[PDB]
């Protein structure tokens, strides 16, 4: 399957160029070699960003099997260094104490290994009450326990992302046929209240219209701040050109001119609110 990795690299290099990023052969090939045994059956997607994060393109391999510890694999191959910071111990704690059924890894095509993904199945979700007991959890989860309880989302953790490069964590809520994020989270009063409570930028008119199409949210937390770092609404659609947003030129190019067919496939779009403003994300699915 060495020639398979060669085609995949060639797709990664070109897709990077579509969004004005240059892939690093020296960073990406070790990752392809490290995960060669799980790439064929993985879901592979490319995620572009506006704002500061526009300087790299993320590549994600998801739906990786139970029995792969993707952080351990990255450590084993020297793709990321050992650390005593709790970020390095959280994955194992989450995998034991939340009903995780598959996983994933995430890398910048220029920057190298950045994140792991831990996925419960939609039929049985994770709980904030179990997260707050984990030795390596950010203190900010319990520090915002009021927020998760207020908005009725504490028992519907649907994905955990761990970013080793930034020392942040993402908690997703909602998705698939699982428990639903309450409707009030997506109505204007709710969007204003949430962003206000979290000290984030007041929602734009574009964000309000986008929120009407959303049923997945995720919260970004860190170990070094008691405050939620950002709040992101997500929308899944096979017609991203029809989203009620103005698309960045790089996003339009990724939709229209990727080196592969996404005919029919869903894209995943996000709008992140921070204390300074709104930044967008779009994921295109190469292998599904
Ligand atoms: Cl993110
Ligand atoms: Cl509801
Ligand atoms: Cl996103
Ligand atoms: Cl998203
Ligand atoms: Cl910011
Ligand atoms: Mg259910």
Residue numbers in the entry: 3 to 290
Original paper wording:
The PT EpzP from Streptomyces cinnamonensis DSM 1042 reported here is a member of a new type of bacterial prenyltransferases, as it catalysis the prenylation of a phenazine substrate. EpzP is a soluble, monomeric ABBA PT consisting of 302 amino acids with a molecular mass of 33.2 kDa. The overall structure of EpzP belongs to the PT-fold family and is characterized by ten antiparallel β-strands that assemble into a circular β-barrel. The β-barrel houses a solvent-filled reaction chamber in which the substrates bind and the regioselective Friedel-Crafts prenylation of dhPCA takes place.
Crystallization of unmodified, wild-type EpzP proved initially difficult. However, methylation of the EpzP lysine residues allowed us to grow needle-like crystals (200 mM magnesium chloride, 30% (w/v) PEG4000, Tris hydrochloride pH 8.5) of methylated EpzP (EpzPm). These crystals diffracted to very high resolution of 1.33 Å, belong to the monoclinic space group P21, and were used to assemble a data set for the unliganded protein (EpzPm-nat). Unfortunately, the EpzPm-nat crystals were not suitable for soaking with substrates because the active site is blocked by a symmetry-related protomer from one site, whereas the aromatic binding site is blocked by a PEG molecule. In contrast to EpzPwt, which contains a fully ordered C-terminus that closes the reaction chamber, the structures of EpzPm-SPP and EpzPm-nat have disordered C-termini that cannot be traced beyond residue K292. The lack of an ordered C-terminus renders the aromatic binding site solvent-accessible, and both methylated structures furthermore contain PEG molecules that occupy the cavity. Furthermore, residues R62 and R49, which both participate in DMAPP binding, adopt alternative conformations when the anion binding site is not fully occupied.
